Amino acid sequence: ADIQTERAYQKQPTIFQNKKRVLLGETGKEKLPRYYKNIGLGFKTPKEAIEGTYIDKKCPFTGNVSIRGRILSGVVTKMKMQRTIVIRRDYLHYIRKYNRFEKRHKNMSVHLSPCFRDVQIGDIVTVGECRPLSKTVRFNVLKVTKAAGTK
Amino acid sequence: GISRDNWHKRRKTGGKRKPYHKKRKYELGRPAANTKIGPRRIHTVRVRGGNKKYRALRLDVGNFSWGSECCTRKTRIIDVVYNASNNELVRTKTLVKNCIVLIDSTPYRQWYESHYALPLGRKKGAKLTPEEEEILNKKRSKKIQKKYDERKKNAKISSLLEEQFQQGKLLACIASRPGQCGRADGYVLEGKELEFYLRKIKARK
Amino acid sequence: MKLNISFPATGCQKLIEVDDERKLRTFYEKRMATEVAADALGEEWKGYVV
Amino acid sequence: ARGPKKHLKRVAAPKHWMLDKLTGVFAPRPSTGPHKLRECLPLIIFLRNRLKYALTGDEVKKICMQRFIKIDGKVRTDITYPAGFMDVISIDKTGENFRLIYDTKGRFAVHRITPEEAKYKLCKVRKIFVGTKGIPHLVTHDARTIRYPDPLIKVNDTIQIDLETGKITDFIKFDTGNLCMVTGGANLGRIGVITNRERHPGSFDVVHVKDANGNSFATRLSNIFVIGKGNKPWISLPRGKGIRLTIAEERDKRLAAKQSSG
RNA sequence: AAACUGCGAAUGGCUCAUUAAAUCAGUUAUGGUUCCUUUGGUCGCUCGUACUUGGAUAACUGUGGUAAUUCU
RNA sequence: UGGUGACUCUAGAUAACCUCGGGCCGAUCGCACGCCGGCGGCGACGACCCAUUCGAACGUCUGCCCUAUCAACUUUCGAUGGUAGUCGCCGUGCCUACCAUGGUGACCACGGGUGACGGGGAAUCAGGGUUCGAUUCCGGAGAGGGAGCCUGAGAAACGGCUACCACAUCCAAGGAAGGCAGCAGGCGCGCAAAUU
RNA sequence: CGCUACUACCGAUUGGAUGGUUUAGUGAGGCCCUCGGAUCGGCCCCGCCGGGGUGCCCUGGCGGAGCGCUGA
Description:
The structure is cut from a larger assembly and holds chains A, B, C and D.
Chain B: E1 41-46, E2 52-58, E3 61-66, E4 71-82, H1 87-91, E5 100-104, H2 106-116, H3 133-137, H4 142-152, H5 159-167, E6 169-174, H6 178-181, E7 185-188, H7 191-204
Parallel strand pairs in B: 3-7
Antiparallel strand pairs in B: 1-2, 3-4, 4-5, 5-6, 6-7
Chain C: E1 2-7, E2 12-17
Antiparallel strand pairs in C: 1-2
Chain D: E1 8-9, E2 26-27, E3 40-42, H1 43-50, H2 57-64, E4 69-71, E5 74-75, E6 82-84, E7 88-91, E8 96-99, E9 101-102, E10 108-109, E11 112-113, E12 120-131, E13 135-140, E14 145-147, E15 158-162, E16 168-172, E17 179-182, E18 191-198, E19 206-211, E20 216-220, E21 224-228, H3 247-259
Antiparallel strand pairs in D: 1-2, 3-6, 4-5, 4-7, 7-8, 8-11, 9-10, 12-13, 12-15, 13-14, 15-16, 17-18, 17-21, 18-19, 19-20
Helix pairs in contact in D: 1-2
The structure holds 3 RNA strands.
């Protein structure tokens, strides 16, 4: 679509799109191979990442983000930011005096690559730790599992 | 003498943070190198670890690459025409990374003429200046002539680049950071990137 | 005003008390490293420049 | 703190140095060197606390500055020089060679070796990388860099270094069935055959090891040091062969030894 | 002796005022960085007065200033 | 060429750049002595670079006292995210310019108080707990209060410097010099703590 | 209710002394930037005694009175 929405040109820094090609040797568009990498830890590169046109330098698959550290999960709580969502991690904290637990939660802002189209509120996301991407963001969505009630 | 700490900022919740220590030297920042276009002037900066940064205050010349032809040349930088960050940087003609500049096309024109034996950016009314029709034509044997003829099949240059060569100055993007390395290196704009930046420049002016 | 006067050719120094303003206004308003004719300091100083 | 620290408190010193608590406030801070601060034995602790060749640090300095102490074939005059695992200490004046080898309690034993064994040392290769126009390089736990290693040598293998020349003369691969010692953790100083390596991508691999008496333990891969091909070590082992007796068997052995005297 | 050069003086010692996810603890990461020293490697890998080049400045000698300084 | 779970890694090739505030490629010192102009042994010191060690720095996850007579807070005085840059040793609203309108909160946000440095630990304790931890180990912070730096690998250093604020020393009145929360010691404070 | 003692509270006694917080203005000092250029030094000119180079004044010792360059 309209990839060039910013004031600066948007492109994958590792893909050279200005190679000289003669006109008569054209099959489809002239030349635009798409850069992507397979992240480790058994995660599958989304098909939209391989055959997409979006430009996201913070994408785990087509961007400049290396996933290393903790692999966590959460439920999507808010999706009101650009390429960023807020997930909620619920857990039980043990108070030893009463030998009991209490519900606590942490809100975590994670980068959502546009390769995960159709991500709802309430479905599980597996996020991986990366370098600080902004003031509060340090995790990238690596997998999206749909909610149980989602048809 | 500015700072670069993250603890003077509000927390994610928006609450105020209390500084538990005074500014540290490793959190320091330095004034921006507003790299102008002019006769070369670079001030070496002593940085953490004892290393050196090259704070370019003035640069009139850079190293720019024609990617399709793989022709890298040293070239005078003429003007700053577009800045995606701040339009003011164009008004002050500041060299920063990713700023769009006008570079002299003469070195790439010379390489093209000496490589393809084809004129480029040359007005049809003129009949070449003295002492350069030789490098264009020369006295070559059958082997050299057939080599240049084989090169001629891939010598077509896109119309946008051709028009720029007629005007004598090419559009380029600065890809190095002049305030950190003292250099304004970059690449000539081509293809859809050139189309986008021409559209942006003409929309701005 | 005292004068610490040196002769580098022989490396010899001497401090002389010159308490006459007439002998000293030749040096007033003159900045450092400027040669000035020290004629006023006396007959023996005629032809010297310091 | 600003800049690096230069002191070591006696109580913050590694416990395997077996330093007491009333001798002083400070422990000899190991100098920077081939081995880490907590995985080394400084020369002063070896020459004073283990060998009793000196009574004070002044006498350790007096010995070292006569150039009587060689570590890995080179004379060292730094009394806090960090000597670590597999390092060979040669005192030619007294004609004795030692190899710094862990005890089953995790301590560097005073293990005397023959002068023929003192010619070489085992080194666990920490990394392999290509640099300098295609030249392969190898880095060991001893922190020595070797150019042009054998193409079969990989990370976690063990090489044999001839101390006179410092080049690889043999190597054991990291394979199941090879003898290995443990150089860190709870099982430090134990010797056994590698049984299996469970791999955890993005985390720490765990290696299972079986003693010569049939006891099975496990460590992280970073704590495994291959000693010999098969179950035959390439170095001499201390009096305890890497078999960690339980406290009951230690008590029984001590009582049997005591009752055999008198 | 002095003085120039080098290195250290960023360690240690003291105290607990500040400081409420801040510090800190355990756990990980730096594939997002710097690193004196130590140790090992590399150091004729560059096709373009040498049987050793230049000017200073201390210490030292001598002349001094200020009431006063580890001033000069 | 090798490597990683994973590089936009490592190595290679090409076109060039290559900072006057210009980077490496030794104009150095000792000892022992030699060998039919030459060839040398053992060291000391120094310089890139790459590892290593010692770290430092910055992030991850979880955990902290009392208080609602604190229920909403933050919002370009950057608040949350995006794009480009600047600066920085580097990741990053760290800062800037455009753009979006976000982000946190009764699972207690924000505010306030703390005769609050945190921890290892201490006292007491049937089991459970309660209170304490300035204090010799580890981490942090500070050097009268703030602020700003120079040198250096490393300091926003205070037995370094510069300035202001408070206090204060000598003076020939022009100027000069300060920082014991180092070890002793003094005054003050106090119920309360040692040798110049 | 009357006394006596003690304790909080209300409050313009338009009460006296320190602690902080902040609009407006001013702002030391450091650092950066753009200039500046007191001085100092090199190559040709009233430095012109001297060299393995003889009527080669051309130096490796002295304002070489130089809108002549040049570096600090």
